[PDB]
Amino acid sequence: STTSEQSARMTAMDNASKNASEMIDKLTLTFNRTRQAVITKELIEIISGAAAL
């Protein structure tokens, strides 16, 4: 029972780390898109402010 339980933990934790890595890859791309959007948006506020003067 121990050897069966230990192998299942190994497999369950392997899937957990692999599924977590899959979500990190998605969030990494979503982060980079939002990172660029904030840089672009905040810059347009400054240019609009300068142009208004």
Partner: protein, 316 residues
């Protein structure tokens, strides 16, 4: 490409045919071939008669091939046609706009050239007032009545964008179409934890309609909360109470899907028109736990609850 044009064609197919008064379609900044598809389809059905003078629909078009000034004012043109029937004649009109975003989108293009200081996300500063004066005209007065089903585009799947965000205030009922729901296969891809209505109230629809409706939205919310735990750990680490919540939620998600009459050509399945009373009974049985023994795919793309059980009997 989530399914607004398919949805609005279905609503015209369902409601506009079974209606005494007139109808008005307004093609604002959308595909021109869809106008050709719609025009000939309405001649085929009979709602637009060429020989007789008994046409039930009035068409107005300023499509995406037109310049901004045209697309910015064509929404008002088709609006004025519907207002005549409301004010002078006093008829129940069915207005249809696709797409109302193109009115606001056209405004931003001319706004730049009109010499104005740009607002957030490059939009015009007069976004609320230009939409306000236009939208406020579309309403049921004391004499006449107008029912408007407006298709609304969402830039980059962002509901917080100024154009769609401002539109929410001018609506009695909303229908948010999610991409994630569409990509799963659930059509129509209407988000159940986002779409809302003002007439949804126990005083109007009834306590049975209300309690069942919020029961569906409750279990879907509980299912959405456990997605993080299922993704990392799994279904095995959830308790028996949670397992039942997930199983029913997936079946409720699939039973929300429905085959459309307009989608008969695309999908191949026959369209279904589920009555009001039978809709409530279907979900109520699933919530109480009368179809836990059945599989999930039996609920996928069916009309009433009877056909869901019939589809499960086919499988063995």
């Amino acid at each position: 490409g989530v399914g607004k044009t398919v949805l609005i064609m279905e609503l015209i197919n369902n409601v506009a045919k079974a209606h005494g008064g007139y109808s008005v379609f307004a093609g604002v900044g959308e595909r021109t071939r869809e106008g050709n598809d719609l025009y000939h389809e309405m001649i085929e059905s009979g709602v637009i008669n060429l020989k007789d003078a008994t046409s039930k629909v009035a068409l107005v078009y300023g499509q995406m091939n037109e310049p901004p000034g045209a697309r910015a004012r064509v929404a008002l043109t088709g609006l004025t046609v519907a207002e005549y029937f409301r004010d002078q004649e006093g008829q129940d009109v069915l207005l249809f706009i696709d797409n109302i975003f193109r009115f606001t989108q056209a405004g931003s293009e001319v706004s730049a050239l009109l010499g104005r200081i740009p607002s957030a996300v490059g939009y015009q500063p007069t976004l609320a007032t230009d939409m306000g004066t236009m939208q406020e005209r579309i309403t049921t007065t004391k004499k006449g009545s107008i029912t408007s089903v407006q298709a609304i585009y969402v830039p980059a799947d962002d509901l917080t964008d100024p154009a769609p965000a401002t539109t929410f205030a001018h609506l009695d009922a909303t229908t948010v179409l999610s991409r994630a729901i569409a990509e799963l296969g659930i059509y129509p891809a209407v988000d159940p934890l986002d779409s809302t209505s003002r007439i949804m109230d126990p005083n109007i629809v009834g306590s049975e309609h209300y309690d069942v409706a919020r029961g569906v939205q409750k279990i879907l919310q509980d299912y959405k909360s456990l997605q993080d735990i299922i993704a990392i750990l799994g279904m095995d680490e959830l308790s028996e109470e949670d397992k039942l919540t997930v199983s029913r939620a997936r079946k409720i998600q699939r039973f929300l899907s429905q085959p459309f009459q307009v989608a008969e050509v695309f999908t191949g399945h026959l369209g279904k028109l589920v009555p009001l009373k039978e809709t409530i009974k279907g979900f109520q049985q699933i919530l109480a736990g009368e179809y836990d023994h059945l599989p999930e795919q039996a609920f996928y793309m069916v009309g009433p609850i009877e056909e869901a059980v019939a589809k499960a009997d086919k499988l063995a």
